[PDB]
Nucleic acid binder design. Structure first.
Length: 290
DNA sequence: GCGACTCAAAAAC
DNA sequence: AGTTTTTGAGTCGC
């Protein structure tokens, strides 16, 4: 009924089929590591502006809620929340140096203003994009929004237990304890250590995330989860690392910039999950029907 | 099939 | 040791 896997930090992932077993909404059993991500491709090279050294980049993503490994498939539920977190790392550059440096895209050099992540859902069989929606903790009693592009600086990915622990923190003392895990506050650095052209000072806001944390995410309520043949559709979640540059032949998305003008989120690397099954609202997807 | 209202159970404090 | 919050999901009815 429950299949258990040991996570890297010593917590467990407990996979169960909601068609057979109903578990409370806030049970720790709802938290579990989801499907592993795989490289799709590398896109635009990034180089340090004076040394010319190529910056080696790696997305480090994980799903921490919403997906179960059931009979060799990864399964989610349309009605339910998932959590997808990601960082990135630069294997050849330590953070403190990275933030003081400046970087260009090698396309012909566009200056990188900042690095950012976005997520997307797709139909894995035909590459059609599928809308995602996020809620606040208030759910129907608060706003809905589409996942946003997240400016980020390189950081190790927090352990699964840490994501769990930080999922619903209000208390100020506890928020203080997790703050340095999730944020860099640029307004707290020594400005005299930085040049005007430094990467840190082209980030759009003083509060900069160290971790892209997409919580309370769902597939859009209108998604069709079965093919016409009644076979399940296969979906995939994608994490894309990009460099945001000033618009003034390679993959990019437009972005509403800080100063108001157009911006380009230029793709650097993309990873995706294996195929995912999503179970819809049918009574037969729930143990209650039995 | 889907928005809405609702119940309920464990986390958060 | 209580109350409030958060979130899986039961149900109504179009």
């Amino acid at each position: 009924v429950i299949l258990t896997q040991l996570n890297e930090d010593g917590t467990t992932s407990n996979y169960f089929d909601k068609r057979k077993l109903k578990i409370a909404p806030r049970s720790t059993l709802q938290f579990k590591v989801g499907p592993p991500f795989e490289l799709v491709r590398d896109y635009c090279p990034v180089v340090e502006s004076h040394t010319g050294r190529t910056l080696d980049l790696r997305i480090i993503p994980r799903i921490d809620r919403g997906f179960d490994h059931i009979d060799e498939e990864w399964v989610g539920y349309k009605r339910n929340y998932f959590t997808l977190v990601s960082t990135f790392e630069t294997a050849n550059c330590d953070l403190d140096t990275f933030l003081k440096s400046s970087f260009d895209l090698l396309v012909g050099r566009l200056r990188v203003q900042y690095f950012a992540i976005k997520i997307k859902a797709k139909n894995d069989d035909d590459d059609t994009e599928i809308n995602l929606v996020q809620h606040t903790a208030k759910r129907d009693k608060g706003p809905q929004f589409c996942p946003s592009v997240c400016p980020l600086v390189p950081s190790p990915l927090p352990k699964h237990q840490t994501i769990r622990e930080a999922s619903n923190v209000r208390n100020i003392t506890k928020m203080k304890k997790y703050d340095s895990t999730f944020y860099l506050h640029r307004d707290h650095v020594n400005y005299e250590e930085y040049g005007v052209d430094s990467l840190l000072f082209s980030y759009p806001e003083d509060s900069i995330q160290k971790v892209a944390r997409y919580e309370r995410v769902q597939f859009a309520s209108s998604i069709s989860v079965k093919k016409p043949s009644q076979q399940n559709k296969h979906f995939s979640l994608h994490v894309i690392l990009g460099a945001v540059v000033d618009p003034d032949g390679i993959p990019y998305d437009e972005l509403a910039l800080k100063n108001g003008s157009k911006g380009m989120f230029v793709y650097l690397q993309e990873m995706k999950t294996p195929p995912l099954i999503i179970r819809g609202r049918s009574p037969s997807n729930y143990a209650s029907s039995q």
